[PDB]
């Protein structure tokens, strides 16, 4: 399947988000080596990452960090923020379908339930954890990279 360099896609997403949240002054740092790529449908990668990155910008206090690594069959994108995080007791239910009635602000994404379902199409998943900053750590994993 087609190969998509990750850095440029994340750059496109950040740029769009920097606008939506320009008033908040979120500082988004990226550590994505140039060779890291995503194998699959570009829009799938962007829908998942757009939802996770929008959440980080929305809930952070100021800092958001994005990093990535890849192995032979998997791609790992980690998004960390310095916000309140996701309570231990909620790191499960946030991936289930909820009452998302008209929450369609122009920057809203597909939601985490749908984002996880997309990663599962690639034999992947999304793991909710805690960052060093104490806020959320979301690790997005896509499989089927070989
Ligand atoms: N980075 C984060 N920091 C704190 N809470 C988060 C974070 N990411 C997700 N959540 C929580 O998980 C919930 C569901 O995620 P998601 O499915 O993206 O929400 P949504 O319905 O699309 N609305 P929104 O939280 O504006 O993205 C959110 O409403 C938050 O309560
Ligand atoms: Mg969302």
Swiss-Prot record:
- Effect ascribed to mutating residue 58 to A: 44-fold decrease in ATP affinity and 6-fold decrease in activity
Changing residue 100 to A: what effect? 2-fold decrease in ATP affinity and 51-fold decrease in activity
Q: Which residues bind Mg(2+)?
A: 51, 108
The places in or outside the cell where this protein is found are: Cell inner membrane
Task: Outline the inducing conditions.
Answer: The phoP/phoQ operon is positively autoregulated by both PhoP and PhoQ in a Mg(2+)-dependent manner, inhibited at high Mg(2+) concentrations. Induced by dsbA disruption and dithiothreitol.
Boundaries of each Histidine kinase domain copy? 1-146
Task: Relate the outcome reported for changing residue 105 to A.
Answer: 3-fold decrease in ATP affinity and 2-fold increase in activity
Top-rank taxon, per record = Bacteria
Q: Where ATP is bound, by residue? A: 51-59, 81-86, 100-112
**Other known facts:** There is a close linkage between the PhoP/PhoQ and Rcs signaling systems, and both signaling systems respond to certain external divalent cations (zinc and magnesium). Two-component regulatory system EvgA/EvgS interacts with PhoP/PhoQ via signal transduction mediated by phospho-EvgA.
Provide the assembly information.
Homodimer; probably dimerizes via the cytoplasmic domain. Probably interacts with MgrB in the periplasm, altering its activity and that of downstream effector PhoP.
| Known function | Member of the two-component regulatory system PhoP/PhoQ involved in adaptation to low Mg(2+) environments and the control of acid resistance genes. In low periplasmic Mg(2+), PhoQ functions as a membrane-associated protein kinase that undergoes autophosphorylation and subsequently transfers the phosphate to PhoP, resulting in the expression of PhoP-activated genes (PAG) and repression of PhoP-repressed genes (PRG). In high periplasmic Mg(2+), acts as a protein phosphatase that dephosphorylates phospho-PhoP, resulting in the repression of PAG and may lead to expression of some PRG.
> Which protein, by its recorded name, is this?
Sensor protein PhoQ
Report which gene this protein is encoded by: phoQ
């Amino acid at each position: 399947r087609e190969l998509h360099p990750v850095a440029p896609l994340l750059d496109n997403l950040t740029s769009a988000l920097n606008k939506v949240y320009q008033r908040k002054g979120v500082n988004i740092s990226l550590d994505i080596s140039p060779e890291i790529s995503f194998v699959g449908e570009q829009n799938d990668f962007v829908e998942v990452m757009g939802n996770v990155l929008d959440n980080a910008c929305k809930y952070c206090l100021e800092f958001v960090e994005i990093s990535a690594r890849q192995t032979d069959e998997h791609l790992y994108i980690v998004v960390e923020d310095d916000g309140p995080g996701i309570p231990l007791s909620k790191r499960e239910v946030i991936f289930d379908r909820g009452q998302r009635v008209d929450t369609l602000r122009p920057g809203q994404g597909v939601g985490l339930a749908v984002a996880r379902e997309i990663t599962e199409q690639y034999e992947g998943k999304i793991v909710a954890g805690e960052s060093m900053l104490g806020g959320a750590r979301m690790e997005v994993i896509f499989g089927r990279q070989h």
